[PDB]
Amino acid sequence: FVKETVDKLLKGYDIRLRPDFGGPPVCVGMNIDIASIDMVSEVNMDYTLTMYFQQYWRDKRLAYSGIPLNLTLDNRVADQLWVPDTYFLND
Amino acid sequence: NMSFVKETVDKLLKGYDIRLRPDFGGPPVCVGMNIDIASIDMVSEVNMDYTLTMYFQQYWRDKRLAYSGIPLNLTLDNRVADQLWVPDTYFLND
Numbered sequence: 001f002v003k004e005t006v007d008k009l010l011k012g013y014d015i016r017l018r019p020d021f022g023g024p025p026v027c028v029g030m031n032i033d034i035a036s037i038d039m040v041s042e043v044n045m046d047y048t049l050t051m052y053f054q055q056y057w058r059d060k061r062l063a064y065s066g067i068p069l070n071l072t073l074d075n076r077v078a079d080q081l082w083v084p085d086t087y088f089l090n091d
Numbered sequence: 092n093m094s095f096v097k098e099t100v101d102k103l104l105k106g107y108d109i110r111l112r113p114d115f116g117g118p119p120v121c122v123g124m125n126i127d128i129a130s131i132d133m134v135s136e137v138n139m140d141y142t143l144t145m146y147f148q149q150y151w152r153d154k155r156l157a158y159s160g161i162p163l164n165l166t167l168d169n170r171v172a173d174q175l176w177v178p179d180t181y182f183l184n185d
């Protein structure tokens with residue numbers, strides 16, 4: 001049952017378009033869990049940081065009504081989804 | 092509007108040959124350069140180089156990518172570049 005509901009989600013899904021493409025902006029929620037700062041260089045004036053960087057947003061194209069629980073899919077789904085173009089300005 | 096737009100984009104890329112520049116046989120493509128320097132991170136007298144970080148923006152016109160219907164500028168996922176023609180700009184002295 002579930003393979004089909006997922007397959008239909010991704011049938012015709014255009015990764016080129018954000019959620020609400022023409023519409024209002026997408027509220028993206030950031031959530032960071034710092035693992036470590038590994039190094040701080042006065043010589044190069046940088047530091048090296050390790051984190052878990054979590055993002056929450058809402059793509060109505062990925063709604064499923066039938067199932068009553070949260071679906072963890074293989075990481076390789078990202079390649080066939082739209083994700084925000086978040087980068088770190090000063091890296 | 093989302094379904095309408097996927098089609099207009101799909102038609103743009105229907106039959107689009109990335110091997111051909113704009114105006115393939117015709118006049119040259121005016122490419123506009125625009126640089127926003129972020130930082131120079133390092134300057135080496137020993138290796139006689141320097142390390143530079145920039146935003147490198149390019150503007151050109153590909154008539155194959157015109158759309159009349161839609162009333163805004165279309166920001167698409169970065170992955171579209173792989174299925175577009177882009178100028179072969181490099182840095183001679185890097």
Ligand SMILES: *[C@@H]1O[C@H](CO)[C@@H](O)[C@H](O)[C@H]1NC(C)=O
Nearest residue numbers: 056057067068069070071072
């Ligand atoms: C499913 O996600 C919701 C929304 O974040 C959350 O409240 C809930 O705890 C999740 N389900 C389980 C089994 O934890």
Ligand SMILES: *[C@@H]1O[C@H](CO)[C@@H](O)[C@H](O)[C@H]1NC(C)=O
Nearest residue numbers: 022150161162163164165166
């Ligand atoms: C689209 O870009 C042009 C610049 O070529 C600008 O004048 C115009 O206002 C932009 N459209 C929107 C919706 O802002």
